[PDB]
Subunit: 314 residues, 4 copies
């Protein structure tokens, strides 16, 4: 009559595929269309370890790795020296905004770099990022930032795939060889190809014209990750769920803007000194539930079709 | 011109399939995606009997059968001795919560078991269930519950497919052979396989990480029912419609939480002594409309493709 | 360069099919799922006549034809003698409700039948319908209604495909051969087959258990219309758009409940003497826009794939 | 290990198609159904020029080309001589409404034509359009409008594919050979074929009976543009996004109604003298982001599958 319980693990082989969808099946522009994080769930797996064991090391750029995938956005309502210092102490990084004079921006970088476990350090000084535009003036700005000790620059554009930005990337790589460059914003595979070819060390993802973020992250990273170019998901995550899903779909780090506005160190959500640990633990538990011991493993399992997904009805 | 009325039953054969969808067609993760109960309807069939004839006997675990598929959730706002006693008198069962000391929980079980037609009885005493965690302490807790006469234990976890829970299942089966074990929570076929292999007598279904309940119930039970492992649908049903659909998709019993908060016997919806009969009759009428004389028949008809469904637009 | 304007009608042949969807393509339970009237639009065609020319004659049952497809529902808030008289004068019909004693119901019928162009007449007296249940008592009720001059009886059930209703149909046909019987409610092809086989002269369409109305109307009528059994759409139309779409999908007449509550003749929307003409003209204009000169033509064009449809996003 | 950055542009060839959907893939009535502008996004491309270089010249009719695709609707709340004069000065055109006597309408045209860079001019006088019906009286009306200097007439109908309108088109072409005729409204390929065959110089797109605008625009223009018959999108655009998408899908110009109600020159949104430049620049930037240097190029790129799209979930 009924099947033997002892055969339950073996009986999974009478099925053509694993329960749920692979990421490739989920992210089908032809059938499901463009997806946001709220449009799907990640299915749980097997828990064989405590969440405390989960490693969250994350590539920010080709040469920079953080102990956590959290990056503060270059918004004048979010990141200044205070934010950048405290994000780095907590294992992420801060991208200092450029709605300020070049001198003011360099002094903020200098404050971070002069500041004295999970901590993001270069020099042994705290890591610092900063945003610039691709206007002629930003060349002088960048030179000042580099003089102040900048580790990574983010080129700040709604539409990054431009001759202006490509030229800026090429100039930076030639002029400041030790500086890591994150280009963007991009939402398509073609945009990604163009800026990778130009010499980008990382990409920033998000945008009549635009693209649903989940679909953007998947299609850009599916291409970029083949070139070892890590991507930042910058679509305005609001919670641990959004962060887990951004990474699931291919992002290496996640940019936090509105999420961090209102915290103590922003220029009330309280202190980042509590909030980032809360997110860090939340992401450890997400990985635990999914059955992966690191974000590197998480990426590998998803790309192999081991991690499964389900599309959600409205 | 027009076809003869006398040929109407025979003309149904010029059609390739029955009107509406089979459950397999409905629950397609590739086309429709993940479904909740509100996303579909069960199509009516042929009424050849009064609703009063409908039998609602339901398997709780491999060895325990109830006269009705109603199970009270182990929530400190829902089930205590009062609830558990009255659920059992009405042909269902109550799972006593464990947000309390082990001694307090055992005394609540003892109250149920010492209490003196559709009634759920073991000993001739009322059936009682209780929830525990899978922490080391819960081993001592369970021993106390068993001493008090416990018939079935529910392992209480958001994500039940863990080494901790698997170990707990194996220990219980070896230590308390006469005790029935319901494992969970699970939402996937793989999770179900793992806990069935470990020795579960039943599964509890429901859950960044999770799954729409209709899809969860279908895919877990489609696997579990082959092993004679009955599943409890625990996604928070709110009405008779939800209960009918949970069972349609494969659930053997349904867990009621919020539905029963506010009733007289919970620790105003009035008395369960009225409400459960109301639900019992409602489910009889649902079965009647669908054209099935029992929940066993209902399961068989659905799995054979006889019972039909329709997906609902928003 | 550009194509000649003179060839525009001929160039439509380089296309594999007409623009938009056929009704069969629209009403696909596998792809689109279950549809309501709000989920689609009828595409316009070619206007070659004034709307005043549009004929709205509609089959109520195998033997009864009305000058307009409007039927008042058997609700004690909608149809009594006043409503039924005035609906018949305007070319539709009224189904008198049965939330009343059999004597009271017969007197209401008698009032209609004794009352002295588009007018619905049998005898030369106004046509009258009435609802009954399928309980033993309704046999005596029906005998009284028939004595009072009843032309058509509607069997009033949420789920009409029952042994009780089948028995009632067979008894009526044998006992009152001149009486037309509308059976229901049904939502599926199988239910329709059963009640047609029993001897129904018409079907009433609409209903955990149920079906989206557009899909119900299409699938029931696609079957029933082959047997010359006209169907009433009873899903609670609210406007001219709903009425046009119900008929487009296969309904022969449309039942109005809530639409007519609040009018002067119901037991403020004003007088039916104004409202029905307003709907009558609205439906003429709908037919005009679609390019059909009658509801008979409308049915034929839709079933041949000439009339086209478009599914609407939310 | 990782792929070389230098190969990034070449690696795009291992993919079967470009990222995102072609317009033909997007506008599938069978899979996605009927779409509105809010249901999709246009994907960004490569920026190789400043937005100021973007040319927005747009065909209004076979013989009339405007410097911008903006047309004011013939609504008595939107277009009169003031509106029409100022729209023409800004490189678009105004269609004067006909909820007025024929004499009053002709005097409004006369005011435009007698008025003394991007400016729309015929004679060297400002271009003027006007709406008429297809009633017998409108023949005398049109003669008066033509005497006043009318350049283009719009036949004003909810459903333009009628013998009345076809007759009117043929009469106009024969009687006033120098007058350009825009026929409509149409929403289908068949309606378009009929009015093109009759002699229309342009079509106006938009409409129980109707069609989602994005789908209407695509299917009508995909046919009409082959005959060099430019189409006006008249579905009530509200913003720059709507305007960009209407043109993306095939429209040559866009009609603005509600958008322009409340402006200074309508019979507060301020002056059109500011608002139209704002829209003009917005559309230049949209084209820039997409990577096209003109609306002619935009049409060509979209029809070739170069410009890509993404369907948006709710």
């Amino acid at each position: 009559t009924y099947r033997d319980a002892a055969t339950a693990l073996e009986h999974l082989a009478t099925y053509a595929e694993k329960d749920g969808l692979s990421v490739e099946q989920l992210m089908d522009s032809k059938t499901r269309g463009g997806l946001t994080y709220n449009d799907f769930l990640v299915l749980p797996g097997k828990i064989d370890f405590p969440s405390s064991e989960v490693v969250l090391s994350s590539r920010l750029t080709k040469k920079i790795t953080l102990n956590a995938p959290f990056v503060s956005s270059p918004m004048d309502t979010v990141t200044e020296a205070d934010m950048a210092i405290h994000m780095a102490l907590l294992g992420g990084i801060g991208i200092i905004h450029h709605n300020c004079t070049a001198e003011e921006q360099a002094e903020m970088v200098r404050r971070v770099k002069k500041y004295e476990p999970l901590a993001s350090k270069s020099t042994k000084q705290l890591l610092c990022g900063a945003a610039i535009g691709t206007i002629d003036a930003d060349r002088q700005r960048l030179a000042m930032l580099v003089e102040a000790g900048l580790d990574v620059v983010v080129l700040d554009s709604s539409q990054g795939n431009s001759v202006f930005q490509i030229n800026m990337i090429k100039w930076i790589k030639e002029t400041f060889p030790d500086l890591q460059v994150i280009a963007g914003n991009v939402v398509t595979r073609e945009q990604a190809a163009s800026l990778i070819h130009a010499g980008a060390d990382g990409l920033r993802i998000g945008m009549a014209c635009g693209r649903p973020q989940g679909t953007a992250v998947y299609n850009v990273t599916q291409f970029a990750n083949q070139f070892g170019v890590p991507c930042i998901a910058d679509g305005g995550v609001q919670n641990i769920g959004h962060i887990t899903k951004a990474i699931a779909l291919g992002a290496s780090t996640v940019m936090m803007g509105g999420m961090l506005a209102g915290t103590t160190e922003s220029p009330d959500k309280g202190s980042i000194k509590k909030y980032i640990p809360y997110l860090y633990n939340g992401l450890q538990h997400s990985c635990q539930d999914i059955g992966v011991r690191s974000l590197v493993e998480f990426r590998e399992k998803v790309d192999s079709g081991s991690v499964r997904f389900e599309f959600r009805t409205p």
